[PDB]
Write a protein that binds this ligand. Structure first.
Ligand SMILES: O[C@@H]1[C@@H](O)[C@H](O[C@@H]2CO[C@@H](O[C@@H]3CO[C@@H](O)[C@H](O)[C@H]3O)[C@H](O)[C@H]2O)OC[C@H]1O
Ligand SMILES: O[C@@H]1[C@@H](O)[C@@H](O)OC[C@H]1O
Length: 302
């Protein structure tokens, strides 16, 4: 744990949280990881326990041991929770992707959203209702949901989520929304404008922000462009930067800090060894679970 909590410092500026991710293994692999999370971050996103493959491995049969643990840990430690993720084409059981009947798929989709959301009803700050539904060019990704149900799945997902748990912020999450002008950013903005105008309950847009070195500076304008979609809020949801330079990190923190709609930042991991992009040492704590320069830089920028 670092003495100065960047979550405390971020919140000091009116932001909701500066969090990270977790699950059983990392929360218990050593003493430092859970200690870091408790002392320096104020929110948690399950790294894998709430995905479709881990919650409903078989049709109508749910497995919540993993998710229960992550939720219980966060609730027990005053950490906000972002559920992740209800509808995605990746980490999706073959039983789902094989459905060819529209109504059957809609029934399955609704039951999955309803069961998963109902279980943690009132404990989730935000839910990534839909994840990565766009092609890089801004067009809708032809996933089973899109192919079988069509664009109406977007409405179905959000409306269902909205009624099941009216207390959670409903988000659409995606990566590569890292620079204003980018095709995917334009596709996200235009589609959401249309969906909001249609009455689809989309409270926020989540920008993953999985960056390469030097891409930090463009994030500010990206956030500015996303803000034009007209959602209640937006957030940096899965932050990591190859090289983990202080400049890149401070640029990203400032990008959110200086944008009114950005409610928070979630770094995709605590320490490098546990990073899904570990070879690039993209996180704020090193292999010894000690703060890196970027962590301190961030604290000093706030
Ligand atoms: O079951 C195993 C998985 O748990 C593990 O891979 C995870 C894949 O997702 C990673 O998180 C995603 C990062 O990419 C973004 O596009 C998504 O929004 C995130 O959900 C997570 O970090 C990995 O651990 O290994 C593969 C399976 O065997
Ligand atoms: O933002 C991540 C990035 O690495 C993308 O290219 O591949 C998976 C994403 O989640």
């Amino acid at each position: 744990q670092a003495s100065v909590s960047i979550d405390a410092k971020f919140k000091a500026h009116g932001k909701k949280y500066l969090g990270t991710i977790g699950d059983q293994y990392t929360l218990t692999k050593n003493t430092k990881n859970p200690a870091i999370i408790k002392a320096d971050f104020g929110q948690l996103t399950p790294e894998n326990s709430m995905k479709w493959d881990a919650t409903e491995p078989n049709r109508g049969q749910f497995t919540f041991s993993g998710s229960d643990y992550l939720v219980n840990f966060a609730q027990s430690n005053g950490k906000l929770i972002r559920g992740h993720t209800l509808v995605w084409h990746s980490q999706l059981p073959g039983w789902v992707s094989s459905i060819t009947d529209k109504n059957t798929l809609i029934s399955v989709l609704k039951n999955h959203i309803t069961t998963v959301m109902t279980r943690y009803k009132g404990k989730i700050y935000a839910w990534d209702v839909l994840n990565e539904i766009f092609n890089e060019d801004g067009s809708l990704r032809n996933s089973v949901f899109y192919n079988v149900i069509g664009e109406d799945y977007v409405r179905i997902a959000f409306e269902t989520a909205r009624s099941v748990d009216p207390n959670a912020k409903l988000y659409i999450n995606d990566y590569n929304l890292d620079s204003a002008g980018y095709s995917k950013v334009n596709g996200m903005v235009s589609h959401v404008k249309k969906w909001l105008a249609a009455g689809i309950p989309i409270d926020g847009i989540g920008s993953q922000t999985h960056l390469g070195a030097g891409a930090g500076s463009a994030v500010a304008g990206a956030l500015n462009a996303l803000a034009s979609a007209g959602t209640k809020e937006i957030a940096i949801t899965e932050l990591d930067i190859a090289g983990a330079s202080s400049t890149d990190y401070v640029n990203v923190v400032n990008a959110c800090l200086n944008q009114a709609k950005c409610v928070g930042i979630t770094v995709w991991g605590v320490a490098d060894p546990d990073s899904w992009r570990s070879s690039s040492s993209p996180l704020l704590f090193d292999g010894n679970y000690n703060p890196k320069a970027a962590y301190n830089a961030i604290a000093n920028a706030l």
